Amino acid sequence: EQFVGSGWSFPLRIGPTGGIALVSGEQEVEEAMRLILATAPGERPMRPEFGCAIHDLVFAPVNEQTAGRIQHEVYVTLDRWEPRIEVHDVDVTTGEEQNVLFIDVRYSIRGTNNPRSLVFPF
Amino acid sequence: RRFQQFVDDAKRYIQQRAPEWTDHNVSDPGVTLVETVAHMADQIVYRLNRVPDKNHLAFLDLVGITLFPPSAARTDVTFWLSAPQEDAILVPVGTEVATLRTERDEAVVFATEQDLRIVPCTMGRLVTQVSGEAVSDRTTDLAESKDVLCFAEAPNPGDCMLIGLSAAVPDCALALELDSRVDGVGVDPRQPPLVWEAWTEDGWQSCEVDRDGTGGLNRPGDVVLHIPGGHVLSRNGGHEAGWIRCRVTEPLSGQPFYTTSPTIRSAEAYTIGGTTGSIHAETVLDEPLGESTGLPGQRLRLEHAPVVAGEPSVLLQTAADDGWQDWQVVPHFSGSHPDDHHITVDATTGEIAFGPAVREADGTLRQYGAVPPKGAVIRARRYRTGGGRAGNVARGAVQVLRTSIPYVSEVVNREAALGGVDGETIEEAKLRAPITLRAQERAVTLRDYEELARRAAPETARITCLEGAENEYGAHAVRVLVVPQAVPDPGGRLRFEQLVPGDALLNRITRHLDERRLIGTRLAVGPP
Amino acid sequence: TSVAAFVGLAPTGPLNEPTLVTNWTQYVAAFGDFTGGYYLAHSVYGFFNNGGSAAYVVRVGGSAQAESAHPGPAQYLGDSSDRTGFGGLEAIDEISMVAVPDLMAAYQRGAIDLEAVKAVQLGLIAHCELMGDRVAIIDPPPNQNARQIRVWRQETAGYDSKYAALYYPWIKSFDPATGQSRLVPPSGHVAGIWARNDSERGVHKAPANEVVRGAVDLELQITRGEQDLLNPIGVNCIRSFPGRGIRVWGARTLSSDPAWRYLNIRRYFNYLEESILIGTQWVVFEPNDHNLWARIRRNVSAFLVNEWRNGALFGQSPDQAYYVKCDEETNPPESVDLGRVVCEIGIAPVK
Amino acid sequence: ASQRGSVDGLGSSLPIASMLPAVFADDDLALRFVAGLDDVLAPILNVLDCLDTYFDPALTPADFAQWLGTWVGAETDGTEAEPMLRAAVAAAARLHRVRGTLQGLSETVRLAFGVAPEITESGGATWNARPLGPFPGRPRPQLHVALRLPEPRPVDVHRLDALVAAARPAHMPYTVEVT
């Protein structure tokens, strides 16, 4: 229902006929999320507050206390800078051994309300 | 500008309750609903004020404006094969090659324009040759081994190597083996800039190189060449085969030749592939469109690219008791009788018109073109898409051939698409009308006469038109003075020969200005 | 309770191994996306779009014997090899619903005769009738036309089983990649509705009158008068109600038994039966005597009463809800091993 | 007047019954009565549809054909035959783009009679690289029109005389010859 627009993908490429690729629809929102979460709240001095501040929660003890702060860190950032999306919960899990923290954000563009989970395809 | 307004909103139509007729004193949920379900007038009125986009297309025909038809792109599709065994028609005309299919909608798909045939071409005669040494009826220079001298161990312009080609099929690829006994200093294959040839019936023709073992044969090489048209070698001997020529060009400063070229020992020719140009096209079958309302003027749209021009490529099948009724496409409706079955199609878009009704005076409802009965199913049997800009495919992108009808594989083009042009939209043509409708085209006054020449010859530095004065023949004709461009040397002096214009330049001006001249006026050109 | 099973052709990925997927991106990482025009890719997408966080897919065919008894539209039991045909689903004990998307792409492409595709559906029904918990969704011939589908159900197939659901008109779904309407069977989409139900209103409510979101248009629109010659016989329908989108109308199972007509009752019982047998796991343990038979009765009763707590039972009070009997009368002294029998009840049907 | 009244046996793209609610559609007299009102709105919807054809000179009724001739320089005076008018209006806009040229005079007389003319004029085109080279061309103006008509009734001369009067650019004399 919400308009999604169009813009170039994160890994930009020549395309079928040359020039520059261009992608819209449900795929585009995923690319914007990939940019927003990956970058630290820096490296972009003109826009400092942009970029999810996740590095402050590295090397914490494995507790739901730090697993809860990250749960709220994503919410503010995923909402402030990406308004064309509605966020449906995050899931912090130690899916391999017990020394890593995986986040599984589930989102759904407004009105379309089809649930999807961001995957970070490498 | 000053457009009348034709809107009277929906509610005002229910306003006429008019309870002043006997006894109909009732409210909303009565079965007086026909007072409201005739709100279609609101839908009708809104349709009046809107002037349809299709209307612009009508009066571009009225004022003599031709819409822009879309084109397509032509490429150089090259086949490949690994089992050269015989000759037959391995490529039916219209064989379809396709690009890779990924998340970018649907891959663009081409279609060959001709029929391609493979031939396992063998050799003819290997002959010794050097500059100034013709064949002189020599054939067996390598028929029984003993090697053959390569340019007398001295390659200079005019040299060539002589080998026959059994068939010389115009659109195939030849694989020549060059087993050379290595002698002297080894060299990079690219270093000697040798040029191939074929001795076409029109004369010598060039060829390209796609393998390292072509020149500078430090090791026995395997030349691969795509045949540039059909040819036959200069028959003096015992082999009427095709022709090859390892002509060596001038010695470049950075690309020099070398003495003591290696001596050829064994050689053999094979066919590996064939190259044929193709146009961006496709053939879709069984595209149902829905059901007909049985009313005149129905319009149907195809959810694909513009239909490519050619033989009638939009076959409309209509359900009937006897089966399928086929509609033949026609040009502009004109005199189409009610009995006849006819349709109108748009080249640049999927809009497909149908029989338009018209209520003439006395209400004859003179209908042009038949109308399908209500409930009939309409489907498109044949449909040839392909036109548009989205055929400007990048170099070497097409990699899969459709339906894999023969035993062929690895179909990869070498050169990028020529590039088609997308047809103009109605909105784009709405901007063309104010300009191209008033582009002079009369040549009345002096300004036009000098201006029109400039349009015909944009490269002219100075043009001016002076009328022939009185006491001069030619029926008050005019003279045109033309000054061709020229750089007057670094020395500051200009030769007189540079001032005269070329004959073609003068002819080009005259040919164009002859058509747009007014009645009974003569023009002559030339320097003052 | 909601996880689904799908059998169809899909490019790449493991062959005949019932992998588990939970998100659409997980699917595309294994078996492509819409490539080749296989119906399984569209059907899963409609299921994922229509709610339902779990899904099992059994890839059998491949990109191109593209279609046959076992390869393609899989029908063989696989000789209980746990790796072939519908036998792959046998070693799951979690899947609660099965569907056959590709089963009839062969019919459109002509690679399978109509009499050949009747047996495989019946083979699927024999699978549901065996495991005793899952429910299969059946799909009719494309472009069947309303007056002819009623003949088809009662003459060609005539399944008459308590584990099959039929949904007549197909769906013109929308492919986001190309934005082109395509025709697909409603097996995947309807299964999405059944997944919403449990996760939004419980198994109690029959899966009907819910938006078939993901849909755009319906071929062969059915009017109400024509429906009343279809609904009682045991065929559902999908209609385009004005201003309310596309909704599923009818919740009748493919059975002629008057006591098992409605879908939710069969949906309820499979949930109900699977709940207790997971609970009362006193088997190959706890000596069969007059003591255990009393223990079983209390354990079952303490659950059904709690089931009446959430509604989904009738009686105004627990005493009038169920009726259990596991005393010495039901277990004769002769039943040395084949013992520990009991009875139970549950009912709350729909409109 | 034109008697552009209603037409019997014509359907509508917007049936009045198809907009009715459900249950209301179950009646018999209401369904037939409300369908009767379609007889009054039947041709209006046909009119709003296919309006493009109502503006193409090759298809549009005779009345608008003359009216459409007003949009451009049709000059439809004296033509009492419908088929003759059909070509004139559509081809009028292309004439004025080259009006006054050799092809324009030839085509206009071709349009008015259906046969190509034979014309000779005091003019031409030439080119020569000789500096200040003389230019040929008839020393005195002259325009001649010849028509190879199969049935020369003794009225075409005046018609050719009248028609060629506007084609000539008010510059040179003329004469009319008809087979």
The CA angle C167-C168-C174, to the nearest 5 degrees, is 85
The experimental method, as deposited, was cryo-EM
CA distance A70 to A37: 12
Quote helix, strand, coil % in chain C, to nearest 5.
Answer: 35, 15, 50
For C230, the token pair is: 């279809």
Residue of A nearest to B397 (CA): A16
Q: Which amino acid is at C55?
A: A
Query: Smallest Cα–Cα separation from B227: which of B160, B164, B162, B273?
Result: B273
The CA angle D137-D141-D143, to the nearest 5 degrees, is 105
The structure tokens 């009185």 sit at B470
B contact test, residue of A17, A23, A27 with most B CBs within 10 A: A17
Q: Which amino acid is at C303?
A: F
The number of CA neighbours under 13 Å toward the Cβ of B332 is 10
D117-121 and D143-147 beta bridge pairing: antiparallel
For B240, the token pair is: 């009427």
C contact test, residue of B101, B102, B103, B385 with most C CBs within 10 A: B103
CA distance B495 to B507: 23
Q: Which amino acid is at B419?
A: G
Q: Which residues contact residue C168 at a Cβ distance below 8 angstroms, ignoring those fewer than 6 apart? A: C140, C144, C146, C149, C222, C230, C235, C236, C237, C238
Going from the C-alpha of C131 to that of each of C6, C206, C305, the distances in angstroms are 16, 22, 27
CA distance C282 to D111: 105
Neighbours of chain C (3+ CB pairs under 8 A): A, B
The structure tokens 């995947």 sit at C188
CA distance C303 to C345: 12
Report how many helices (DSSP H) and strands (DSSP E) chain A contains, helices first.
2, 7
Containing H/E element for B467? strand B460-467
What is the number of other CB atoms lying within 10 angstroms of the CB of residue B386? 27
Residues of chain D in contact with residue B34, where contact means CB-CB under 8 angstroms, are: 16, 34, 37
For B419, the token pair is: 């590039």
What burial class does residue C265 get, using C-beta atoms within 10 Å of its C-beta: 0-12 exposed, 13-18 middle, 19+ buried? buried
Per the CB < 8 A criterion, the answer to whether B180 and B220 are in contact is yes
**Would the CB atoms of A16 and B103 count as touching at under 8 Å?**
no
Residues of chain D in contact with residue B63, where contact means CB-CB under 8 angstroms, are: 72, 93
Per the CB < 8 A criterion, the answer to whether C268 and C203 are in contact is yes
Q: Which residues contact residue B254 at a Cβ distance below 8 angstroms, ignoring those fewer than 6 apart? A: none
**Would the CB atoms of A117 and C176 count as touching at under 8 Å?**
no
Residues composing chain B? 528
The number of CA neighbours under 13 Å toward the Cβ of D129 is 12
Strand, coil or helix: B524: strand
Task: Extract long-range pairs of A83-89: CB within 8 Å, 24+ residues apart.
Answer: A84/A2, A84/A3, A84/A4, A84/A5, A84/A29, A84/A109, A84/A110, A85/A29, A85/A33, A85/A109, A85/A110, A86/A110, A88/A115
Containing H/E element for B223? strand B221-226
Going from the C-alpha of B428 to that of each of B425, B432, C313, the distances in angstroms are 5, 7, 69
Residues of chain B in contact with residue D103, where contact means CB-CB under 8 angstroms, are: 515
From chain A residues 62-121, the ones with a CB under 8 A of any chain C CB are: 114-117, 119, 121
For B456, the token pair is: 């015909």
Strand, coil or helix: B130: strand
Residues of chain C in contact with residue A111, where contact means CB-CB under 8 angstroms, are: none
Residues of chain D in contact with residue B511, where contact means CB-CB under 8 angstroms, are: 125
Strand, coil or helix: B373: coil
Residue of C nearest to A118 (CA): C25
What is the number of other CB atoms lying within 10 angstroms of the CB of residue B31? 9
C19-21 and C5-8 beta bridge pairing: unpaired
Query: Smallest Cα–Cα separation from C126: which of C60, C72, C187, C75?
Result: C75
Residue of A nearest to C45 (CA): A114
B contact test, residue of D50, D94, D109, D174 with most B CBs within 10 A: D50
CA distance C132 to C98: 12
Per the CB < 8 A criterion, the answer to whether B520 and D171 are in contact is yes
CA distance C338 to C340: 7
Task: Tell me if chain B has a CB within 8 Å of the CB of D101.
Answer: yes
CA distance C317 to A9: 62
Q: Bridge partners of B290?
A: B378
The structure tokens 């229910």 sit at B14
Strand, coil or helix: C119: helix
Per the CB < 8 A criterion, the answer to whether B481 and B528 are in contact is yes
Given resolution (angstroms) = 3.5
For D136, the token pair is: 């040929």
What burial class does residue C275 get, using C-beta atoms within 10 Å of its C-beta: 0-12 exposed, 13-18 middle, 19+ buried? middle
CA distance C297 to B61: 90
Task: Extract long-range pairs of B203-211: CB within 8 Å, 24+ residues apart.
Answer: B204/B245, B205/B229, B205/B231
Residues of chain B in contact with residue D16, where contact means CB-CB under 8 angstroms, are: 34, 37-38, 40
Residues of chain D in contact with residue B519, where contact means CB-CB under 8 angstroms, are: 100-102, 105, 121, 123, 143, 168-169, 171-172
What burial class does residue C10 get, using C-beta atoms within 10 Å of its C-beta: 0-12 exposed, 13-18 middle, 19+ buried? buried
Residues of chain C in contact with residue B303, where contact means CB-CB under 8 angstroms, are: 180
Chain A residues at the B interface, defined by Cβ less than 8 Å, are: 14-18, 27
Chain C residues at the A interface, defined by Cβ less than 8 Å, are: 23-25, 48-49, 51, 53, 176
**Would the CB atoms of B105 and C177 count as touching at under 8 Å?**
yes
Per the CB < 8 A criterion, the answer to whether B501 and B461 are in contact is no
For C264, the token pair is: 């939710």
**Residue in A25, A116, A121 nearest the CB of C23:** A116
Instruction: Map chain D to HEC letters.
Output: CCCCCCCCCCCCCCCCHHHCCCCHHHCCHHHHHHHHCHHHHHHHHHHHCCCCHHHCCCCCCHHHHHHHHHHCCCCCCCCCCHHHHHHHHHHHHHHHCCCCCHHHHHHHHHHHHCCCEEEEECCEECCCCCCCCCCCCCCCCCEEEEECCCCCCCCHHHHHHHHHHHHCCCCCCEEEEEC
CA distance C88 to C82: 5
**Would the CB atoms of B62 and D93 count as touching at under 8 Å?**
yes
Per the CB < 8 A criterion, the answer to whether B314 and B146 are in contact is no
CA distance B9 to A82: 41
For C341, the token pair is: 């029998």
Per the CB < 8 A criterion, the answer to whether C192 and C246 are in contact is no
The structure tokens 């997927």 sit at C21
Going from the C-alpha of B195 to that of each of B125, B260, D156, the distances in angstroms are 20, 19, 73
CA distance B191 to C149: 77
Residues of chain A in contact with residue B394, where contact means CB-CB under 8 angstroms, are: 14, 16-18
Query: Distance from D150 to chain B by nearest Cα, in Å?
Result: 27
Query: Distance from B106 to chain C by nearest Cα, in Å?
Result: 8
CA distance C204 to C206: 6
B154 phi and psi, to 5 degrees?
-155, 95
